[PDB]
Amino acid sequence: AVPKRRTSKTRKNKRRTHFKISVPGMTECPNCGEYKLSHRVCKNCGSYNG
């Protein structure tokens, strides 16, 4: 099956409405001061210490 018609810029830009990504969901660690992911270790100097 082949497309019967060409695709518009309107129809092409409406389909990619939900073709996005979200924020990684990060927090601040009060041992290294830098941002980090949740339920994970500070990738910089530090550790989990849960």
Binding site: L37, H39, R40, V41, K43, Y48
Partner: protein
């Protein structure tokens, strides 16, 4: 079983035994999140056989552990079975279950897989 881990029956038993014998010689290894939850039950059942100490327990543990020469003893080529029933079994003589701890690292490069660290508590 519990989860197939993307392999077949005979390949899954050869991989679970490879990680269990690695957590005894090094006591800390890096792996994937899905494989860390499976080897968590394989090692914790081998420590229970080490707290028994019977000859029937030494033979029920020879079916899993591979034959490697730990130098953790640092003398006399100690086997992966001789480290068990010894210093490992003495460390958890009072602890009742839960001899494993897993920590999460993050998605790795080129794979997007969750790297973790599993170690003996």
């Amino acid at each position: 079983g519990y989860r197939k881990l993307g392999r077949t029956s005979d390949q899954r038993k050869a991989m679970l035994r490879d990680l269990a014998t690695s957590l005894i010689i090094s006591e800390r290894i890096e792996t994937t999140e899905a494989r860390a939850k499976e080897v968590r039950s394989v090692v914790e059942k081998l420590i229970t056989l080490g707290k028994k100490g019977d000859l029937a327990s030494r033979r029920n543990a020879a079916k899993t552990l591979r034959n490697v020469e730990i130098l953790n003893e640092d003398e006399t080529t100690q086997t992966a079975l001789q480290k068990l029933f010894g210093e490992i079994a003495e460390r958890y003589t009072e602890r009742q279950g839960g001899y494993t701890r897993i920590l999460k690292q993050g998605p790795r490069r080129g794979d997007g897989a969750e790297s973790v660290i599993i170690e003996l508590v």
